[PDB]
Amino acid sequence: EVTQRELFEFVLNDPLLASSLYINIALAGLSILLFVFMTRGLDDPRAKLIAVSTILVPVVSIASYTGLASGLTISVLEMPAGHFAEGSSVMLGGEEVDGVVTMWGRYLTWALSTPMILLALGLLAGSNATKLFTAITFDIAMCVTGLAAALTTSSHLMRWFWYAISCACFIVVLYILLVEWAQDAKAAGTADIFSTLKLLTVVMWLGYPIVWALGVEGVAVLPVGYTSWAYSALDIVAKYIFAFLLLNYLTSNEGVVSG
Amino acid sequence: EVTQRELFEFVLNDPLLASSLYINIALAGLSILLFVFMTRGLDDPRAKLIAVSTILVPVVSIASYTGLASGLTISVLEMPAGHFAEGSSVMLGGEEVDGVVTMWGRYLTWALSTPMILLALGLLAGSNATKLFTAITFDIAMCVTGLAAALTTSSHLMRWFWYAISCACFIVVLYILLVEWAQDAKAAGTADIFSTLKLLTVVMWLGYPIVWALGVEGVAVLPVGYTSWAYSALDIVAKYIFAFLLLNYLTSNEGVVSG
Amino acid sequence: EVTQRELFEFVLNDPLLASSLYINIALAGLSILLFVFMTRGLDDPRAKLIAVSTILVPVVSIASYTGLASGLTISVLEMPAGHFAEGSSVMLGGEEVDGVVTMWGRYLTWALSTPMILLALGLLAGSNATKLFTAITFDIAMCVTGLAAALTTSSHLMRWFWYAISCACFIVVLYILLVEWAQDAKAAGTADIFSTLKLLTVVMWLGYPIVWALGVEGVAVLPVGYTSWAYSALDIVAKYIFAFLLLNYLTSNEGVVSGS
Numbered sequence: 192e193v194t195q196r197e198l199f200e201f202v203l204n205d206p207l208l209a210s211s212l213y214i215n216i217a218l219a220g221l222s223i224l225l226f227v228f229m230t231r232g233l234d235d236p237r238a239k240l241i242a243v244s245t246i247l248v249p250v251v252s253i254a255s256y257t258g259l260a261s262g263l264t265i266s267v268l269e270m271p272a273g274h275f276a277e278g279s280s281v282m283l284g285g286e287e288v289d290g291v292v293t294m295w296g297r298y299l300t301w302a303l304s305t306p307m308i309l310l311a312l313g314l315l316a317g318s319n320a321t322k323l324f325t326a327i328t329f330d331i332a333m334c335v336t337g338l339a340a341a342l343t344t345s346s347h348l349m350r351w352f353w354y355a356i357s358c359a360c361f362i363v364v365l366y367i368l369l370v371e372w373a374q375d376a377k378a379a380g381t382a383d384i385f386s387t388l389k390l391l392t393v394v395m396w397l398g399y400p401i402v403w404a405l406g407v408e409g410v411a412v413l414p415v416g417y418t419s420w421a422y423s424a425l426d427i428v429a430k431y432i433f434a435f436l437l438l439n440y441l442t443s444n445e446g447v448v449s450g
Numbered sequence: 451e452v453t454q455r456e457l458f459e460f461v462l463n464d465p466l467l468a469s470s471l472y473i474n475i476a477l478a479g480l481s482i483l484l485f486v487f488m489t490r491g492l493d494d495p496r497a498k499l500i501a502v503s504t505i506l507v508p509v510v511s512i513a514s515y516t517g518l519a520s521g522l523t524i525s526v527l528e529m530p531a532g533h534f535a536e537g538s539s540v541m542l543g544g545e546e547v548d549g550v551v552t553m554w555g556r557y558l559t560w561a562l563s564t565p566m567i568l569l570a571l572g573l574l575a576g577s578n579a580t581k582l583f584t585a586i587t588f589d590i591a592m593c594v595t596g597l598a599a600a601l602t603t604s605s606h607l608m609r610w611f612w613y614a615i616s617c618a619c620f621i622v623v624l625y626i627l628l629v630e631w632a633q634d635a636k637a638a639g640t641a642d643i644f645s646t647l648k649l650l651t652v653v654m655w656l657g658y659p660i661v662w663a664l665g666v667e668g669v670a671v672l673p674v675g676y677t678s679w680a681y682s683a684l685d686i687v688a689k690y691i692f693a694f695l696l697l698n699y700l701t702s703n704e705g706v707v708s709g
Numbered sequence: 710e711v712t713q714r715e716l717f718e719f720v721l722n723d724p725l726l727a728s729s730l731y732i733n734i735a736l737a738g739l740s741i742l743l744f745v746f747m748t749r750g751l752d753d754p755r756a757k758l759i760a761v762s763t764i765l766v767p768v769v770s771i772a773s774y775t776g777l778a779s780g781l782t783i784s785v786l787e788m789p790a791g792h793f794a795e796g797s798s799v800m801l802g803g804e805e806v807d808g809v810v811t812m813w814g815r816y817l818t819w820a821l822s823t824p825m826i827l828l829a830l831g832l833l834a835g836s837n838a839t840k841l842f843t844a845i846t847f848d849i850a851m852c853v854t855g856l857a858a859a860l861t862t863s864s865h866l867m868r869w870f871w872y873a874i875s876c877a878c879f880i881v882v883l884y885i886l887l888v889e890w891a892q893d894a895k896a897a898g899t900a901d902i903f904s905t906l907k908l909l910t911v912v913m914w915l916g917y918p919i920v921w922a923l924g925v926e927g928v929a930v931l932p933v934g935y936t937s938w939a940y941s942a943l944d945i946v947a948k949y950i951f952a953f954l955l956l957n958y959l960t961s962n963e964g965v966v967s968g969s
């Protein structure tokens with residue numbers, strides 16, 4: 192029933208929500224331009240592979256935020272019986288509607304942006320193909336099951352079941368980052384930079400499942416405008432500054448990553 | 451206008467349909483646990499690539515059956531004039547509605563699980579990249595056109611044309627299995643086990659298009675409760691037992707697949 | 710609401726629109742058969758990789774056109790305020806329905822077919838993995854942001870912003886084709902054939918955003934039936950004849966691209 196235009200207007204009209212989305216369209220767009228400029232001097236192909244994979248992070252991100260701000264990837268869903276937010280209402284302009292604002296566009300595009308973060312990080316750490324494959328596949332599985340959790344309205348139980356399965360996929364990714372690649376990085380001569388990015392990645396990434404559980408999709412203690420800003424803040428660090436730091440290093444150590 | 455909740459409880463109250471789904475959520479989960487412990491000894495990166503791709507099959511499966519059981523990946527569609535299922539009703543409770551229950555969730559996830567089965571088999575057979583690429587791309591095409599056949603409600607003829615395209619992609623896959631990898635496995639010293647898994651695969655996979663044609667998607671001589679169980683049986687073999695036989699071999703012959 | 714059968718019948722009974730779709734289901738089918746027959750003699754794995762990547766182009770295409778003709782991948786969307794097609798009607802079924810017939814199924818399958826055109830071209834040119842990865846990812850982004858633009862009905866400005874993002878991705882692909890692979894083909898020993906296919910591809914691909922801009926999705930100077938024939942005509946060249954020309958070279962020069 193709810194129109195895309197109505198969701199687009201819902202975002203606008205709500206300063207918190209609007210700012211969380213439009214600021215990242217601008218920041219993601221500025222990042223891409225800055226990163227392209229920063230790596231214009233690279234010559235080595237492997238270094239260039241790391242740079243492109245990294246640049247695709249804000250490319251996917253600017254598209255993701257446009258999808259959310261435009262209302263294309265947002266829906267109003269009614270939570271199942273027992274859910275902390277069942278019976279909630281949203282109100283579009285002058286009409287009130289049952290349900291909560293489900294910004295599934297975030298969970299959907301993470302399946303594209305997070306694999307690129309992992310690919311760049313893995314290559315930076317000199318990972319073999321087997322570990323890259325494992326990290327990336329389970330990362331995608333994590334994102335898609337999380338998406339499924341948000342989209343499930345039939346049962347409150349099923350929603351948290353999806354969430355658990357997603358967490359299990361998340362532990363695999365964490366294992367490879369904290370255990371496997373931390374070791375490979377030393378052998379690749381990138382331990383230093385990897386430690387900084389590994390710590391950043393693990394701490395920031397742990398924040399998403401927390402925000403999800405506290406927002407309307409979970410226990411509903413945080414308003415939609417708050418949960419959104421929390422994700423955008425995480426994105427600013429997990430994506431943009433994370434990419435700046437990686438590329439700043441790459442442009443200064445092109446030779447070490449070459450092989 | 452049917453709700454996810456209505457589809458969820460529809461699965462309930464229907465013993466055959468419900469059991470065929472929840473039973474595989476458990477069996478797939480149990481498979482994952484068993485496989486992880488069976489492969490804890492592997493150290494060779496190539497041996498571990500084969501193990502992870504094999505483990506991903508039941509990982510895609512728990513999510514797929516959860517999507518089905520939850521009602522997330524099921525819909526009620528009205529079949530086109532001339533279709534044997536056209537004119538049928540379902541009634542999601544007390545208000546009966548026209549159409550048939552379409553478990554497209556199965557066709558959708560196959561595009562993710564079957565490529566992993568093929569990846570494991572190809573690697574085991576010592577396949578080169580060209581053949582792996584060919585098998586996987588045509589397998590995905592097979593699954594996606596099968597999903598399209600099921601979601602097409604406009605024309606009975608179109609539904610079957612889609613089915614034909616899917617069959618042509620399937621022949622490509624069957625060809626690489628029976629002709630190409632069967633030869634490659636000899637060079638890899640895995641002809642023995644490949645011949646076993648190859649036989650199991652071809653025989654089980656061939657059953658899927660038969661079930662489709664017999665069920666509500668085709669001539670509708672079989673009720674969904676039966677078609678769902680047929681697929682579930684096929685999955686138990688084509689996926690879980692297949693995974694066990696491959697992994698049990700791998701753990702006893704890691705030196706063979708290494709390199 | 711608007712049913713799949715209604716769109717299917719809409720396509721039928723509309724000579725222009727119907728022909729633009731059914732003609733290509735046929736041409737893509739015949740292309741696949743012809744290409745399979747043409748490449749029968751290939752034995753080198755790298756030569757065969759190029760052939761299979763090329764053949765997948767019409768495979769994805771036949772599936773695409775079936776999705777459009779069946780109505781599966783078509784929808785009626787109402788354009789936002791200020792859009793030159795806002796307030797349009799399509800007359801669907803036995804009633805008049807507001808909006809425009811959006812054949813989004815084209816944009817969706819391009820994300821699968823165009824990367825294959827690029828994979829075959831890049832290999833022909835002896836491209837390293839970095840440039841292939843770059844060409845394919847940005848090409849997929851171009852297609853997906855194009856699909857998003859056509860699917861956006863909330864804001865006229867958002868539609869064109871998506872379009873711009875898509876164009877930016879297109880320039881990346883164009884740069885790799887015209888600058889990078891043009892030079893790599895010289896080392897690969899496929900300078901002449903790559904240059905020919907490079908030019909044909911660049912000229913035809915430039916046609917798509919022009920058609921989008923002129924069609925109902927854009928400034929709406931071209932009705933849906935005409936916008937559809939424009940795309941179908943472009944596909945016949947950029948996909949089917951392009952593939953025929955590439956395979957024609959491949960099967961007479963297998964040794965040149967054999968490498969590894």
Ligand SMILES: *C/C=C(C)/C=C/C=C(C)/C=C/C1=C(C)CCCC1(C)C
Pocket residue numbers: 298301304305333334336337338340353354355357358361396397399400403426429430
């Ligand atoms: C640019 C976005 C990033 C780096 C996103 C990261 C997202 C995650 C680590 C999400 C994890 C989740 C779970 C572990 C449980 C279920 C729900 C999710 C999807 C929020």
Ligand SMILES: *C/C=C(C)/C=C/C=C(C)/C=C/C1=C(C)CCCC1(C)C
Pocket residue numbers: 557560563564567592593595596597599612613614616617620655656658659660662685688689
């Ligand atoms: C885990 C699932 C497996 C191994 C599924 C295999 C499925 C197939 C071989 C399906 C084939 C089909 C056709 C050849 C024609 C059209 C309908 C399908 C999708 C049932």
Ligand SMILES: *C/C=C(C)/C=C/C=C(C)/C=C/C1=C(C)CCCC1(C)C
Pocket residue numbers: 816819822823851852854855856858871872873875876879914915917918919921944947948
């Ligand atoms: C078989 C299809 C082919 C070769 C399609 C090519 C399509 C393009 C080059 C599309 C480009 C577009 C833009 C640059 C802007 C936004 C709209 C598009 C998708 C038409």
